[PDB]
């Protein structure tokens, strides 16, 4: 039982924030920020000085078919069916918020035959046809290694294909649902590079789940052997009392250390920090390292 000082946040202020909160409920859309109970809700939904207010619309309802021990998203054996209006409504809300860079995600839908690859592809197609110059990033589930489902999402005009390994291989069974493993998540990023050679790969790992420095180095080196472009490192924080406890709060100085090691291995950009999540300032990192 440890409580750190550099992981404290603020209660959401509603100057530019209720516009996003009321838009999500007008179109009956969900987001991963509210379900996962992220502390960076105020920073991401409301730019302090000059940061475009962004979000992460979570598709296919607020209930996941999987139960990951680090995630507080609701889990049900059979979630409600797909909403056909979700891909169309999402494209409107994103263009309404004036985003030049948007990142989309969704819960796992193991009950769907394609796992929702066609539903995600229609959300990107409606969003790119409406605004061709907007940048889209998809945090894709593993689809249980369905190479056809991964190909369908990667060929939807995607700019950055994102699928997270979450933690080191030795902690896959304790942290993630058994339907997800380390080698499977790598085959999601590898196959996206084969079907779409010009795509940008991106993944996120979490620290504080019992991993050591030796295990983390082998994971990043294996990701570079998978030709993964981008990497994200962040401190795992306990969502609810029912989920896993934090094992070790990584120091911000060591968080900065892995940023140099990522630059050594050749990662196109390594975003590391205690509060750094997958989509945390994703558009800002794109403008600083991926445009030449």
């Amino acid at each position: 039982l440890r409580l750190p000082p550099w992981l404290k946040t603020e209660i959401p202020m509603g100057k530019n924030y209720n516009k996003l909160k009321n838009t999500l409920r007008n179109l009956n859309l969900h987001t991963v920020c509210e379900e996962a109970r992220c502390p960076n809700i105020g920073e991401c939904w409301g730019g302090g000085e000059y940061a475009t207010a962004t979000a992460t619309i979570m598709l296919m309802g607020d209930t996941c078919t999987r139960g990951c021990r680090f995630c507080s998203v609701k889990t049900a054996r059979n979630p409600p069916p797909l909403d056909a209006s979700e891909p169309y409504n999402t494209a409107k809300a994103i263009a309404e918020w004036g985003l030049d860079y948007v990142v989309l995600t969704s819960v796992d839908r193991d009950d769907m035959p394609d796992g929702g690859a066609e539903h995600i592809a229609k959300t990107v197609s409606y969003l790119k046809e409406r605004n061709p110059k907007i940048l889209v990033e998809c945090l894709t589930p593993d689809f249980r290694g369905d190479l056809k489902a991964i190909e369908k999402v990667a060929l939807s005009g995607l700019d950055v294909y994102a699928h997270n390994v979450e933690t080191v291989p030795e902690l896959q069974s304790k942290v993630r649902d058994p339907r997800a493993n380390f080698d499977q998540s790598l085959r999601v990023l590898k196959h996206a590079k084969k079907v779409q050679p010009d795509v940008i790969s991106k993944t996120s790992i979490m620290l504080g789940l019992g991993e050591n420095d030796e295990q983390v180095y082998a994971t990043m080196k294996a990701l570079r052997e998978a030709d993964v472009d981008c990497l994200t490192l962040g401190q795992y924080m306990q969502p609810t009392r029912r989920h896993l406890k934090v094992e070790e709060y990584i120091t911000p100085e060591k968080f900065k250390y892995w940023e140099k090691v990522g630059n050594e291995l050749g990662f196109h950009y390594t975003a590391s920090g205690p509060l750094v999540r997958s989509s945390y300032k994703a558009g800002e990192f794109f403008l600083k390292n991926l445009v030449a």
Partner: peptide, 17 residues
Amino acid sequence: GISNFAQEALGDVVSVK
């Protein structure tokens, strides 16, 4: 005390994160 609106978006005091 604490506001219900704040409490529902606060967390679990042990907050938890």
